[model samples]
Target: GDSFYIRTHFEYEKESPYGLSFNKGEVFRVVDTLYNGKLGSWLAIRIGKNHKEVERGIIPNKNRAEQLASVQYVQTKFPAYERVVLREAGFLRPVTIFGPIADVAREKLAREEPDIYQIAKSEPRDAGTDQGIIRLHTIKQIIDQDKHALLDVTPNAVDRLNYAQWYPIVVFLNPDSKQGVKTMRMRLCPESRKSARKLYERSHKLRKNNHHLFTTTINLNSMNDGWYGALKEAIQQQQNQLVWVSEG
Candidate 1:
């Protein structure tokens, strides 16, 4: 929701006319073209508080400008995490598992707590608002109502759920576990069953680049219910959030 601009976290000073140095607490706009943009230089104006806008020059952006693109369209983002506060509710918080094996958890989480959870598919349009309205029934719902929910997520959905009012408990299924990815893909295909190689590449690249958005990285370690207790613990003591809880 705070996506339009950013508040600098650390202070920076100008070294040359080629640079537009800024300090901590200054808010800047966004971009990803060229400063010529790289060593990954990001361009923006050091709006307000300081009537003097940033000079038209270069400066590295600290916000992990999680640049977006498609196969993958582009939706540039610069979001940080905020540690969640402790608050037990009468109803359990909503859970949205993201990543390749998200479907696996979505199914099992629902099954294990039948009365507490329900499934909600990720529709490109209606499903966004639909998920919001359907709740308040003294019950919680998982991200996708159906199996393909994670795979067919809407563009910008990562932040959508992040900003949604219910404040969902998000779990990112780890994509790096070699043994884990192979098993899940094998179950999904007979042809590319051993295609763990492609997914493994994604672990450090595309999909795996999203560890910033989860409450827990449910590493797809192996086929077992062993993590169920830990998952429950993460929920109960959500203080377990660290990789940038809300602002990390």
Candidate 2:
């Protein structure tokens, strides 16, 4: 979404046909993922420093940068608690599970791969439209599995995350890059409601500290909606730091 931002995790320098350079801890608004025959995969970015135009070049399709904005919810499991309680603690929103896809869905996805590649090759207009379309295609296959049904894990197994769940929302800045996809890996374990809030609060603090450990898609402009609106607003008001993107 337009609300998110991806910062450079390392110093990058290159010259020639595609001359692009950046320092460690620089930020940019990712425009699209492209595959240059000369440069494997690169980010088309709007520079994050003072709303400048970032040189168009490959940013190396690697996890050298911070990625993923995640929040987890956990449910306590005990012998005394009924299964209904666990069932109700399902995912809170539309998220892609990390497991298998149906055979029919697999075929459909295979057929769509060619089309997805074409879209990934193009210049990005809206931040999320192409990726969103890819997401829609994948989400259609997983709809049946999103039954919100309780996972059948024995009490003994619960302690070991036999009922582990996560809502992985992929925000791909480099769709053609294989490395960019791995950052979406996250799982929600068991924790108290207070713990969830604490995590959110701490994340905001960490974000303000500008530590590599913390990053988020939430910015000042889009802080009024979504799960972390209050936290987003608090950070915006207090720190006045928008780490996601800059003006054109």
Candidate 3:
């Protein structure tokens, strides 16, 4: 959702009929049930040189499922292609949604890996799903350079949509920092990962800190108890604690 408009037009562009309105939140429900109960794809947006073309669609099936399917196709094929176009326009690096299972995944992680639970609990209080959603929505203000609504850590439009908002869940880290380090793991749904990839293609700005800090995406199989124990042991070896970061 952070890349809703960014992915469509790329770079920072003025609001046009082409962009998707992620602020509504209900867009998911509407999109999931469209086109004979299929998802909707191909969001229409208008901005930059190709503003007009972005706003309107030339295809058929104007239903929600069609919309999701279109976006999915874009996700599988183009991936973060829109961001690529925008990065050429002199925008910051692209960003993406790493996970929406902030709290839920953390819980699962905590239950399966109690040894590292401490590190998981060290996550920021507001970094859960609710804040993730807020961060995703805040992208609009950052792209528009509306300082009134921009977030602190990820001030750049691109990073604001991706990295700054999400934290790392490391199984490895410098021993010295491990004691003080707080980490979290989030389960990345396909939709959320696609959203992140969309933003990632826009800008190249990446974090210079520990790359092992975040788990941007997760494999579904990793959700099992065996994997959890290994993950916990991995972090525990780093002298870090693992815990559930998601509240709900």
Candidate 4:
């Protein structure tokens, strides 16, 4: 299939004059596969860092390294309502979505929860089988902004509204291999409890006023049905509707 590099998990020293030596976390691009009449299976690789080719040698193919060291999947869309619900439910705390993860365990829970909304799998990388694999942060965070209310709103106003609304910011990362490392913040509106119908009206207001600072804004409390499906559609719609804020 496709050729890719493998990362050395542990340091391997130059023991004999025959084989190559490499450090832990070093990457080597695959060159050719070799079979020893006496030893079994081995890989011929060009020594290098981050996909650059340097030198050539053979290393034992069993447990020495891994391929596709930093694979990842991006999730930037959610049903309009689910986004609103998540924001109003206090989901504003930022979280790291993908990073290094231990193998043999399903750690990326959100990614594993559903396949309908995920991106296509990367090439030369097998799911859970390849040693050089990326990790998914499965656990999600829900920040409770209103654990103790009335700090910002008056008691009478709170009573009129039934309870104080605390919205959470959703965090997203840019998928550029090197750039866009900073987390982007998206604020969801909390106008769902007033009435399901009020949600759509409030969402337009929120987006029109404060969407410039955010990658996107969403409303999650209304129409609980198919929120996930709607979220996917919303992402597509947002991509199509992208335009300049200032008028001519």
- Candidate 4 on 79-108: residue-level lDDT in tens? 111101111122222221111110100122
Q: Which candidate is the best by TM-score?
A: 1
By TM-score, the candidates rank as: 1, 4, 2, 3
Backbone clash tally (model 2): 1
Each candidate's number of clashing pairs is 15, 1, 44, 9
**Tens-digit lDDT track of model 3 for 1-248:** 43233232111222434334321001111122124424324433333221233233211123432343443322122123222222122221112222222333344554554442321111244643432224444444343441122122322323323333232222221111111112112233332323333232321232232221232322223333244344444433322322212111
TM-score, prediction 2: 0.24
lDDT for 119 (candidate 4): 26
Residues 52-98 of candidate 2: C-alpha lDDT, one tens digit per residue: 76555555443322221111122223111111111222332221111
Query: What local distance difference test score does each model get?
Result: 0.47, 0.30, 0.28, 0.30
Off by over 4 Å in 4: 1-4, 36-41, 63-248
TM-score of 1: 0.45
| lDDT (Cα, 0-100) at 93 in candidate 2 | 20
Worst 10 residues of 1 by lDDT: 146-155
